[PDB]
Subunit: 159 residues, 3 copies
Amino acid sequence: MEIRKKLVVPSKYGTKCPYTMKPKYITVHNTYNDAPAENEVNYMITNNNEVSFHVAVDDKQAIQGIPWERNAWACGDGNGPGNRESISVEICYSKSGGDRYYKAENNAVDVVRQLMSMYNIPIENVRTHQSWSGKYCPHRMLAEGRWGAFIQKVKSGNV
Amino acid sequence: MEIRKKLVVPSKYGTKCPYTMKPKYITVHNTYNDAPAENEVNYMITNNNEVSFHVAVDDKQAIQGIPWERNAWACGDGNGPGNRESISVEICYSKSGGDRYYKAENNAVDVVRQLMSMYNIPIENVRTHQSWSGKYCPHRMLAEGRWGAFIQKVKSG
Amino acid sequence: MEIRKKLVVPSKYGTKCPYTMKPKYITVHNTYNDAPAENEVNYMITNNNEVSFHVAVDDKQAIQGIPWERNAWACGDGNGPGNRESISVEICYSKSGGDRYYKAENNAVDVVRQLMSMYNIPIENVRTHQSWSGKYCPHRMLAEGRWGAFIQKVKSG
Ligand SMILES: [Zn+2]
Ligand SMILES: [Zn+2]
Ligand SMILES: [Zn+2]
């Protein structure tokens, strides 16, 4: 699926993505919200908080808000490898779940595979936010035991 | 046991418990302090930091500082299920331990049981702060390997 | 090996080590950087940030910047057991790794053994930063699953 562009303005880089980055990992998150990717991204690139992520994926589309080679503030590890070396993928509708959420997760498999090919990132480098800082994220995937199956789809699925 | 109420003023909900909450989990903590429940609560409901918990339990009493159906900021996972769907119980005197602490922990067993029955929360949904953010809390319970026994006490009587 | 001393001035204690401490644990970290122990410590004692560690160990020497019996802000657990009861050991050159790092690690095994017999800290009291707050540190050691072997070498020598 095509990843739509809806990037934050350069004048806000200092707040949303101040550093350049050489992607080495991909971090998967759950939004813990029930908003479409367009809403997640629009809010993220417009507010003034030092909080961001690279792409949001819902049941219908994938939207990029931060250049892949600039950092995002989403892993909670300060200037650690999560925030400074990983591209963050946000999966929408995880708050209430439902068909919309599982559709978004499966679309995220496709998004993650595109990023792996793009930056030559190995399957061992696809990580959970939890692995970087301890936060229970992706919450629904961890709660339902879906991470293992997700990794296998990313590793060799044809989507 | 009786859980006494000494709730934060409504005007501070924006800071201490900004969202309504449908309790789904109970999170157990250790204060890593040697102060009675009353002290813990007084400080928590008055300062202006976005840091809070629902009830503090010591060897003598249990004092609630935040409404059970409003979130508290105690699990370290920002706007995640920890802070937004769990009721936090702080067990006092864990710092130096001793009878005071073990007595408080037994009282916490009752408080957790009461909350479980109140909001129909299953035993598998009683969690450690560590499970939500990786923080080593409840520190004493983890250090002495008491979590399993605590859960069994809660599951029965 | 010999642990040099480049402690911070008493005036900077309120920020680098404002609390006395009775060492009970030893926390091993990775600098996630490629600077020598001299630079790490020097930089750490020059700025006035609420961030510090007790000793930095590279491939050549080991330098202490904070008194062993004073806390150091390095475990990210606020006033928790990691920051208030453990001595923090920073292993240099982990960013890019290389022989320099692996050499700094073995030296760190030495620094840890010395601190263990000096303050009678048991082997199961040697922890990672990750165990205190969930942060992925020591990143390289964890990334390469070198923790189990590290502890085994500390247990024997
Ligand atoms: Zn996340
Ligand atoms: Zn806690
Ligand atoms: Zn560390």
